């Protein structure tokens, strides 16, 4: 398996067959597979040295690992996108031995002195072919020379088998399994051979080869493979239940933000709810966790304007729940990234000198922003895409809050709707679903560069189309949902989480 | 193949034939019920 | 029911043999892949090279005794086969 | 106490062994143990030394058998450092074998023989596969007399019986005994012992097991 | 195995002993120890065809003799038929009830349905001369290229001392056709060559078959000299050019050894001084450099390329035409595969 | 103590080669357990030297320093046969014994 280490030094050689035995539609699937793979690799934050070679009768070298441009994912993607099937269509042979000799020359050092870090370096080879080497000698003997060059199998104390991993993609309608099985590396309970049907369900393909050794705890990293369950797709999702006499049973949602802390809404709970009467279950486990203390925001007050004449006031509807014991991150347990952090900086693939202001502008441009939230339907998590009304319809989104029962007599709309509120819902430009009352406290999720950033927390909705387990009938056109902006309470969170080592800018 | 028999390629051979296995060590630390600890170990069989 | 086969080993070492079987009209199949030793012709021999008595006071004189042991000639050795040298020493109690 | 993973090994294979170190009260003690492995005639080939303190009285060790080896009985011998004269031992066997697919048990009706029994010694054969199914085949059984280390074989007591329903039956008659021995005196036979050797082969001709009942 | 020096100092006395343990080549070892086993397979004569039984029929006869000082006691005969052959039931009933002879009922009542492996028990076998028996066999499966049969003999007290014989109507004694170059032996159980008949001689089709991975090299050669041996002979060929670069380099073009089994000299003898067009696969060449030898096998293809003066016959005109087009075609355009 | 090994599954159909199954091990709390699984065919080839709990107690009984199932020839012999030494201020004392083994066993 390929290891993802940020402190790593890794060479990835991409070899793509171009013989007439492939076909155009199959060649395109080969490229589309590589584009998703390189994108997912850069989304994890590892920058390897890419080598790109297309071969038929004669290999054609596009990117050399010695070049500094080989570590540029977008530049390599541009080189890959430029590659055409009919570039050398008239030389559509299959001389695989020469293609491996070109890769062998790339990792080869001049003279007899390897540069320091040669054994420190990881090497990965990805081959796509029809398994029909028809010209030239045997290609397998060059693999042994590559195994030779990397000093593999040369020491009982240090095998170095994991410094070389060979994956082979069986492409084209006609394919030879025998030669393909010989080329690929052979390791216990690890798949290195993939077929034509594997071009569908790409996330599952990468799930077999990717090893998240040094990237277990990274925020906003999701497994989207078909076999995955709800929490494979939402590692941060947390379900909080409070059962207390008179109040009765109640459940809200939360999002993992640190080792001990979960972020959720404030109006779901109260100070009178005792810590022993509050149960929290994090995604991937059904065991209810014991909590230590709940940190309500200081400026929170549900009855802030109760004496003035307004029934309910939802300003500063955020709260942090501290677990008694620390979580251990995994494939189904990971926090969601927070703005203006070193994780978000690396997630957006920005240089480390990028400021918090620049990231705010990128997250919140003066337009309608695409977003999504998570909701439950028959105990199953599902995604609902919505638009954040930050553009010209931002004023209309705030005005529609008055049609909620209990706020008819408010004169000033800017008074009740505080800058903490983020506004979603409605039918313009497209119909946005409305949250259930159980969906409150969940995160507001934005997708950028194959990663997920949290931008808000679900508060309340104008029209409760999801009154109790039923979301019947289409929604009113003025039905809006409101969310607490993270930038307003960002200083307070930075104050609380200064010891949590999240890399705030 | 279209006939009512398994093709050869998808027939996978049993090959793990060690004489002795399960050479492991474990400590009884499970909750003692009547002083007797009940340990559960899920083990891979051989071929 | 037993189905015999006849084969010839072609190269030395712990070589592998694999057979497969599948039944008709049911999708029940089985395959067996086992290995057996391909041994070059010959048999193990435990021959003796040399046996001598040690006595530095009486033999060799002046408290020191030294002598060489030539390596075994083994002209009947099978090409590219293992060969171990077993050395054993045991003292003589000189206390009556 | 010395434990091994198997009772009999192949050349070129690994030997795993664990030593349990207890005091005179059978509780785990932490002391240094001296271990030696000897060949069939008593030549030490490999030796170990380790302390069981903080290991809860368990010393797991291992050793590889070369292909160049003398088959026979091999013994692991151990003694504490503070008591070198008190030596414990356990044995294992080295042979070139193949695993059988069935077991052969030879059961006399009585685990003894009465000399003047007219019917003679009845021995029931029981055979079954290792996975629990009944064996069908043919067996060849032979009898003999054991006196100390001296074994006398009766050539004409040989019988050939098929194994049916996973079982067989063979009887060594008194006449065969009196004919087998040249001694018409029955008093000299008292105190001696008999032994049975059975050779069973399946009707497929692909396997064979030799079993022995003695004493 | 190494020599060393021993040095002892001080009062006292001891004993030095050095033993070497190694693999020694067998000297006059008898594989069929204590057994002289002979097995003969022959087709049934004209007495069998007389009642118009109209089927494939052969007779298997077995004879053996013990080598010990006295007659050996009870022994077992394990017999394996050639594939698709079932022994005649009526012959085994006659043999089974004979004295010193027995066949189990469970084995006996099987008949043609599953009797492929046969077990015959003999209470004793004479040591002075051969004891024999025979029975008929019939083919009922109708498959060509049958597996050779085998008969193994051993006793109830010792399977270690045993003997095994094979039989096959076309392989003489049923032995495998392995090829040996002194100490280095490799198998040679193959057809001698592919496609030397060529009733419909193509060119376009042959180019497509030259572009498949099964063909690793295509050589134009000229036979220099043949060197005889026992059960094989080697053909000294001069490589003129590599039409397709194979597992080895051209090396300017020098003599490369080709070897044919004795059973393939009967199929087709190559003639010296003549040119030949050849192609094969990577498994054909044998040994290690510089002692590589190319074995003629079922994957090898050879056809004569006439010399210039030989090309003038009107039919060999077109052969030298087409063999020349294949020459220029492969080198310049390669394969679209 | 008490160590018992059984299957984790209730029963179910006989296991499949290579299939995952649950092994249940019952024993006193705080004890260390070692495991070994062997094919029964190996013991059909050689059943010698198999260690068991009864053979452990057999070595203990063979290591006993007592040589008599109780009683004795007199009051002095009672303790010396059991494996004890007795000594008083008055003068009565055990018989002197300087041998570890028991003289000529009956067998
Ligand atoms: C890879 O190429 C093969 C053929 O080169 C494609 O096979 C096609 O399958 C459809 C099935 O409906 C046929 O109708 C076509 O005639 C086939 N050949 C074509 C389209 O050239 C196969 O679909 C290709 N794989 C992918 C993923 O596109
Ligand atoms: C690359 O090469 C060396 C060997 O030349 C590798 O081996 C290490 O060598 C250093 C110093 O000799 C030791 O301290 C390490 O323990 C060795 N590593 C092992 C045995 O795994 C080493 O991997 C590399 N050396 C570097 C990076 O300095
Ligand atoms: C040395 O070679 C002999 C060859 O037989 C091995 O077997 C011994 O053979 C003698 C016969 O001369 C028997 O008396 C012994 O009983 C055999 N040994 C055993 C252990 O039974 C022998 O094992 C080889 N090795 C040694 C160290 O003697
Ligand atoms: Mg191709």
């Amino acid at each position: 398996k390929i290891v993802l280490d940020p402190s790593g030094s890794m060479n990835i050689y991409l070899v793509l067959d171009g013989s007439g035995s492939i076909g155009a539609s199959n060649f395109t699937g080969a490229k589309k597979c590589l584009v998703n793979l390189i994108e997912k690799v850069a989304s994890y934050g590892v920058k390897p040295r890419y080598g790109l070679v297309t071969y038929a009768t004669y290999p054609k070298i596009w990117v050399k690992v010695s070049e500094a441009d080989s570590s540029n994912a977008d530049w390599v993607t541009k080189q890959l996108n430029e590659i055409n099937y009919e570039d050398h269509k008239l030389k559509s042979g299959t001389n695989t031995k020469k293609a491996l000799q070109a890769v062998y020359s790339m990792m080869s050092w001049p003279d007899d002195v390897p540069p320091e870090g040669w054994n420190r370096t990881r090497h990965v080879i990805i081959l796509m072919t029809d398994g029909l080497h028809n010209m030239g000698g045997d290609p397998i003997t060059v693999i042994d020379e590559i195994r030779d060059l990397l000093y593999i199998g040369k020491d009982r104390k240090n095998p170095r088998e994991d410094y070389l991993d060979v994956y082979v993609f069986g492409v084209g309608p006609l394919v030879n399994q025998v030669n393909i099985n010989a080329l690929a590396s052979k390791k216990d309970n690890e798949q290195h051979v993939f077929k034509v049907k594997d071009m569908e369900n790409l996330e599952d393909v990468f799930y077999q080869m990717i090893d998240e050794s040094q990237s277990l705890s990274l925020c906003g990293m999701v497994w989207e493979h078909r076999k995955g369950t709800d929490y494979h797709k939402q590692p941060w999702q947390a379900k909080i239940s409070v059962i207390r006499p008179s109040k009765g049973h109640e459940s809200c949602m939360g999002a993992v933000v640190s080792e001990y802390f979960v972020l959720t809404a404030a109006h779901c709970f109260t100070v009178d709810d005792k810590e022993h009467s509050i149960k929290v279950s994090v995604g991937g486990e059904k065991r209810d966790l014991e909590i230590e203390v709940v940190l309500f925001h200081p400026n929170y007050n549900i009855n802030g304007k109760k004496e003035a004449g307004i029934p309910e006031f939802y300003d500063y509807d955020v709260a942090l729940i501290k677990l008694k014991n620390k979580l251990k991150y995994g494939q189904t347990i990971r926090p969601i990234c927070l703005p203006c952090t070193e994780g978000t900086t690396r997630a957006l693939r920005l240089p480390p000198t990028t400021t918090c202001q620049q990231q705010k502008e990128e997250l919140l441009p003066a337009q309608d922003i695409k977003a999504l939230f998570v909701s439950e339907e028959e105990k199953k998590l599902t995604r609902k895409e919505v638009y954040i009304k930050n553009g010209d319809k931002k004023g209309s989104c705030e005005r529609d809050a008055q049609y909620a029962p209990g706020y008819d007599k408010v004169k000033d709309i800017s008074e009740v709707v505080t800058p903490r509120f983020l506004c979603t819902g409605g039918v313009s430009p497209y119909a946005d679903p409305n949250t259930c009352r159980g969906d409150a406290g969940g995160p507001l999720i934005v997708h950028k560069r194959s990663r997920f950033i949290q931008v808000g927390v679900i508060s309340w909705g104008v029209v409760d189309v999801c009154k109790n387990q039923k979301r019947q009938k289409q929604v009113p056109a003025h039905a809006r949902d409101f969310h607490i902006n993270l930038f307003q309470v960002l200083p307070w969170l930075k104050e609380k989480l200064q010891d949590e080592d999240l890399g705030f800018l | 193949l279209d006939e009512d028999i398994i093709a050869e390629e998808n027939i996978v051979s049993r090959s793990e034939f060690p004489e002795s296995w399960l050479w492991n060590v474990e400590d009884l630390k499970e909750p003692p019920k009547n002083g007797i600890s009940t340990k559960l170990m899920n083990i891979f069989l051989k071929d | 029911l037993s189905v015999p086969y006849v084969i010839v080993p072609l190269k030395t070492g712990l070589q592998e043999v694999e057979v497969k079987a599948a039944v008709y009209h049911h999708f029940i199949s089985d395959g067996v892949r086992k290995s057996l030793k391909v041994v070059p012709e010959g048999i193990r021999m435990n021959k003796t090279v040399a046996v001598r008595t040690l006595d530095p006071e009486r033999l060799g004189r002046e408290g020191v005794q030294k002598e060489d042991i030539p390596p075994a000639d083994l002209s009947d050795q099978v090409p590219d086969t293992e060969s171990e040298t077993r050395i054993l020493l045991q003292g003589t109690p000189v206390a009556q | 106490f010395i434990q091994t993973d198997k009772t009999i090994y192949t050349p070129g294979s690994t030997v795993l062994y664990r030593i349990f170190t207890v005091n005179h009260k059978l509780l785990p003690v932490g002391r240094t143990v001296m271990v030696n492995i000897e060949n069939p005639e008593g030549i030490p080939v490999k030796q170990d030394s380790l302390s069981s303190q903080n290991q809860l009285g368990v010393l797991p060790l291992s050793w590889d058998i070369p292909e160049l080896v003398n088959m026979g009985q091999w013994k692991i011998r151990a003694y504490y450092e503070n008591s070198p004269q008190q030596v414990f031992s356990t044995e294992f066997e080295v042979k070139e074998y193949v695993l059988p697919s069935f077991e052969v048990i030879v059961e006399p009706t009585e685990k003894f023989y009465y000399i003047y029994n007219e019917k003679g010694l009845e021995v029931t054969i029981t055979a079954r596969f290792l996975y629990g199914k009944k064996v069908e085949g043919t067996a060849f059984v032979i009898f003999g007399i054991q006196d100390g280390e001296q074994r006398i074989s009766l050539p004409e007591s040989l019988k050939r019986i098929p194994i049916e329903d996973g079982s067989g039956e063979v009887v060594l008659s008194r006449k065969v005994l009196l004919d087998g021995v040249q001694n018409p005196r029955a008093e000299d036979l008292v105190g001696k012992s008999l032994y049975v050797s059975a050779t069973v082969i399946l009707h497929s001709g692909s396997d064979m097991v030799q079993a022995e009942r003695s004493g | 195995n190494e020599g060393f020096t021993v040095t002892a100092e001080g009062k006292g006395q001891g004993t030095l002993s050095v033993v070497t343990m190694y693999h020694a080549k067998a000297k006059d070892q008898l594989t069929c120890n204590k057994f002289d086993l002979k097995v003969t397979i022959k087709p049934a004569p004209e007495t069998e065809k007389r009642p118009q039984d109209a089927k494939n029929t052969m007779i298997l006869e077995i004879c053996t003799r013990y080598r010990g000082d006295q007659d050996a006691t009870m022994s077992i005969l394990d017999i394996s038929m050639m594939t698709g052959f079932a022994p005649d039931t009526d012959d085994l009933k006659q043999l089974a009830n004979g004295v010193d002879r027995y066949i189990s009922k469970y084995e006996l009542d099987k008949a043609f349905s599953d009797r492929n492996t046969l077990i015959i028990y003999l209470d004793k076998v004479s040591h002075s001369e051969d004891d024999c028996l025979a029975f008929k066999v019939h083919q009922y499966f109708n498959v060509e290229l049958i597996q050779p049969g085998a008969v193994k003999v051993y006793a109830y007290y010792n399977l270690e001392e045993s003997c095994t014989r094979f039989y096959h109507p076309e392989k003489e004694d049923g032995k495998l056709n392995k090829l040996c170059r002194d100490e280095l032996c490799r198998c040679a159980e193959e057809n001698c060559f592919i496609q030397k008949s060529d009733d419909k001689v193509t060119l376009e089709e042959r180019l497509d078959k030259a572009c498949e991975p099964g063909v690793d090299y295509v050589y134009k050669t000229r036979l220099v000299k043949v060197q005889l041996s026992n059960d094989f002979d080697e053909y000294i060929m001069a490589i003129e050019q590599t039409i397709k670069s194979g597992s080895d380099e051209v090396q300017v073009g020098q003599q490369r050894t080709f070897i044919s089994p004795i059973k393939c000299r009967e199929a087709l003898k190559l003639e010296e001084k003549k040119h030949y067009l050849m192609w094969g696969l990577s498994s054909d060449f044998w040994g290690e450099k510089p002692n590589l030898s190319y074995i003629i096998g079922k994957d090898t293809w050879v056809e004569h390329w006439p010399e210039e003066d030989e090309c003038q016959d009107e039919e060999n005109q077109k052969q030298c035409q087409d063999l020349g087009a294949f020459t220029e075609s492969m080198v310049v355009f390669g394969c679209p595969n | 103590g008490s160590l018992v090994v059984k299957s984790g599954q209730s029963e179910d159909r006989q296991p499949v080669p290579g299939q995952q199954m649950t092994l249940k091990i019952e024993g006193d709390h705080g004890a260390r357990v070692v495991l070994v699984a062997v094919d029964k065919g190996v013991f059909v080839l050689n059943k010698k030297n198999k260690l068991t709990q009864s053979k452990i107690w057999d070595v203990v009984e063979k290591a006993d320093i007592g040589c008599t199932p109780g009683s004795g020839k007199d009051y002095a012999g009672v303790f010396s046969d059991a494996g004890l030494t007795f000594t008083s201020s008055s003068g009565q004392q055990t018989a002197q014994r300087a041998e570890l083994q028991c003289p000529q066993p009956a067998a």
Side-chain angles (χ1 to χ4, degrees), chain E residues 183-200:
Chain E
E183 283 290 339
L184 187 59
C185 301
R186 196 176 73 179
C187 198
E189 277 288 340
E190 299 172 335
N191 297 91
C192 287
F193 56 71
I194 30 179
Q195 295 179 324
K196 279 184 168 285
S197 48
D198 296 352
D199 56 331
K200 291 172 288 295

Side-chain angles (χ1 to χ4, degrees), chain C residues 2 37 44 46 82-84 88, chain D residues 11 43 45 67-68 70 204 206:
Chain C
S2 171
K37 298 182 181 183
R44 310 288 163 84
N46 51 359
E82 300 84 335
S83 57
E84 57 115 82
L88 185 142
Chain D
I43 303 302
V45 299
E67 279 279 329
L68 291 174
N70 297 132
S204 59
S206 307

Side-chain angles (χ1 to χ4, degrees), chain D residues 93-196:
Chain D
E93 186 169 337
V94 175
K95 267 188 176 62
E96 304 176 295
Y97 63 86
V98 293
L99 294 178
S101 61
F102 69 102
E103 60 179 28
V104 175
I105 309 181
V106 278
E107 290 178 290
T109 52
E110 305 299 324
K111 295 188 293 180
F112 63 90
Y113 181 64
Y114 177 67
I115 323 103
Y116 305 107
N117 183 20
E118 307 178 64
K119 294 160 53 63
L121 177 60
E122 302 175 284
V123 178
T124 307
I125 317 296
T126 294
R128 58 170 60 89
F129 289 98
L130 293 177
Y131 37 89
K133 298 303 179 182
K134 297 164 176 293
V135 154
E136 302 298 318
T138 297
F140 319 117
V141 54
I142 195 176
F143 297 89
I145 309 177
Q146 179 177 260
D147 187 12
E149 287 76 63
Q150 181 177 87
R151 281 190 175 191
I152 302 300
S153 186
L154 299 181
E156 205 161 295
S157 64
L158 181 63
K159 301 290 183 175
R160 169 182 53 205
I161 49 179
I163 296 298
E164 310 174 71
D165 202 6
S167 181
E169 187 66 50
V170 62
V171 182
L172 178 65
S173 75
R174 182 184 178 191
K175 178 65 182 299
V176 171
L177 176 55
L178 293 172
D179 195 9
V181 302
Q182 314 297 288
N183 190 7
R185 290 196 72 188
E187 304 86 300
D188 299 334
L189 304 179
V190 188
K192 304 181 181 305
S193 62
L194 304 170
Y195 69 89
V196 186

Side-chain angles (χ1 to χ4, degrees), chain C residues 8-76:
Chain C
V8 169
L10 304 184
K11 57 184 300 180
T12 55
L14 180 58
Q15 304 307 137
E16 170 178 284
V17 175
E18 183 175 47
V19 292
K20 295 184 180 187
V23 313
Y24 280 93
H25 309 300
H26 286 93
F27 289 89
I28 306 172
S29 63
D30 189 21
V32 174
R33 178 169 72 235
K34 289 182 181 182
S35 299
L36 80 169
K37 298 182 181 183
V38 178
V39 177
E41 53 283 86
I43 199 183
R44 310 288 163 84
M45 263 73 167
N46 51 359
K47 306 173 182 178
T48 298
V49 174
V51 282
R52 291 188 300 258
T53 305
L54 298 179
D55 201 337
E57 174 64 45
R58 187 63 61 253
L59 307 177
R61 306 275 158 151
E62 209 191 285
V64 286
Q65 180 184 359
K66 14 76 181 303
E67 190 54 59
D68 292 331
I69 300 180
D73 60 329
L74 29 76
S75 54
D76 55 351

Side-chain angles (χ1 to χ4, degrees), chain A residues 116 118-120 155 157-158 160 163:
Chain A
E116 192 165 81
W118 51 274
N119 56 340
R120 158 73 177 78
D155 192 3
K157 189 171 177 182
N158 190 228
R160 293 183 54 75
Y163 293 92

Side-chain angles (χ1 to χ4, degrees), chain E residues 267-280:
Chain E
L268 193 276
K269 288 183 179 179
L270 302 170
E271 186 162 322
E272 301 164 293
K273 299 303 179 180
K274 282 182 171 297
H275 282 86
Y276 295 92
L277 178 62
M278 315 166 78
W279 60 63

